[PDB]
Design a binder for this molecule. Sequence first.
Ligand SMILES: Cc1ccncc1NC(=O)[C@H]1C[C@H](C2CC2)C1
Ligand SMILES: Cc1ccncc1NC(=O)[C@H]1C[C@H](C2CC2)C1
Lengths: 304, 304
Amino acid sequence: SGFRKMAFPSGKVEGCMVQVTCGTTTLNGLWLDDVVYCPRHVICTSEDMLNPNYEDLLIRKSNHNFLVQAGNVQLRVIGHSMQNCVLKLKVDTANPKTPKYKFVRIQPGQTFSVLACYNGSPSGVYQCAMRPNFTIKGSFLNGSCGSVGFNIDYDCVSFCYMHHMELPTGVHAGTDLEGNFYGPFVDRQTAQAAGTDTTITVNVLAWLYAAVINGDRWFLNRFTTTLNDFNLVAMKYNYEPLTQDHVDILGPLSAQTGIAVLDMCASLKELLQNGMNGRTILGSALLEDEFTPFDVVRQCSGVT
Amino acid sequence: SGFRKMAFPSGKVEGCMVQVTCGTTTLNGLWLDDVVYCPRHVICTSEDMLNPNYEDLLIRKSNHNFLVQAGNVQLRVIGHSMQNCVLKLKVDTANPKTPKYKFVRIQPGQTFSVLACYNGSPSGVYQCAMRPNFTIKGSFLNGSCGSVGFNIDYDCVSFCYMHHMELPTGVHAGTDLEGNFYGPFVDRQTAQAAGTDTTITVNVLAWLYAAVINGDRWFLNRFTTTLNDFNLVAMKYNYEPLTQDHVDILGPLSAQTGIAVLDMCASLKELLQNGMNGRTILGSALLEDEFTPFDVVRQCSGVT
Ligand SMILES: Cc1ccncc1NC(=O)[C@H]1C[C@H](C2CC2)C1
Ligand SMILES: Cc1ccncc1NC(=O)[C@H]1C[C@H](C2CC2)C1
């Protein structure tokens, strides 16, 4: 028992972190096979970041200008290319610590772990969720760019995120491992405002099932609702609309606890309308939305 | 910016996790140098756990009864001994992945990361705090015993905890790496109730400084207090008494923000007396006490 914001073990990702320096900017790179992946804004100076033309900036850069260091040893750069907002540095040595890996572009609502890094060195690991406005509420300082987000299925690491920037509101923006930004953000020092940060309804429900499984049941009520009635309530409180796809994914949790999905929606509805009244659920005084139904099943079953 | 419940990177600890089987019980072991550390209750059967005599139980066990497997390879056991509530299995091979390490017995209020494991395999990593009642609010299922708690200083892993049991209240109990239980708990299937779980005052204050550093300032007030006045309030709300030692450790945070420690205590006092009034601090609707002043400084500076 006990329910925690758990991140994946980070060892397989630690073995891929390298430091990339270009000119006077140092950030993190991801070394997989003979390729180092890093944010293309590594080639920018402070003046360049206001309105950068990456194609023009990259012309003045050669393989020897990109300094890649893994631990205390230097990697020889034999090729460089730009793929959207990421640079791919072909090195002459394949990373001996390369795990089985995939590059996946996640959907908003999905969760992942972040290995925050500085100068190619890991500082910590935490669990995140891609917000419905395509931002992440991370913990990143200057030098953390190139830190990656990932999920693990037994031995395979699915890289889903690479950190690029902090918006003026302190929230974070970045790309998948193909260089495409999540959301409408661009890698430029310009004010870009985030859209409405709605709550991930299916995740809150999965977390409510995790609470029932672990003993916290006070919020269970004698009511039920319909998908349309629930969604009227969800709209009012800036919750994501729940679909039958979301109900389908909650199926294993509904089966284990014996509480029908719509019954849990009615409990969630009363919680939205009345609040917690000074009480807590899983040691939290607010409704947690950064546990997917898969994370709840994984944690409550002990998947390694 | 952004403030997250961050765990240490777990790679160095993943390389030490092994599976230990004795008879029909399988749990986790920690392989450092040529020694495997695991909970001594691995030698117990269900009937034994009610009132076990570990010295008597250990007499009927030989080196060959302890099956140690690291990944898919078997370790040869050449010695076994009991040190308090942990068994030390001398193996003929030193762990090639042994990091620089120390065994430390932490004080309540101190935080650490837990690499939850099942069958010698890591499932996840989360941040914990040793509660003032010597329990931990973890996330552990059957098979997770032997999972360890640790902190990291650059390259040195300080092992501070080894998981042993779940109390009937769903909270967790365990030992330091010398086999001594934190608190008054014994490794026996008997009801053992936890003491008052007070809030770690110095940690809440450190988290309030982290909130000011990251933009959340609404809770700052025009008041101040004294250590004795604050402690009257802290006693009422089951908060740990604050000492000048705690004030000393908050010094770097007080210096960075320019908010005197006692001024922050007055803000905390008003928060205890009035509540959050539906507001949040660092995305939390309750006062977080599992960030030490050291964790706040580390995260807010980017220590790797
Ligand atoms: C200062 C900081 C903190 C956290 N995360 C990231 C950063 N860095 C940035 O946001 C910088 C590089 C960005 C360029 C437009 C691409 C501006
Ligand atoms: C079932 C479980 C779940 C989480 N953590 C731990 C456990 N296991 C236990 O508490 C068992 C082994 C204990 C023996 C008295 C020493 C009883």
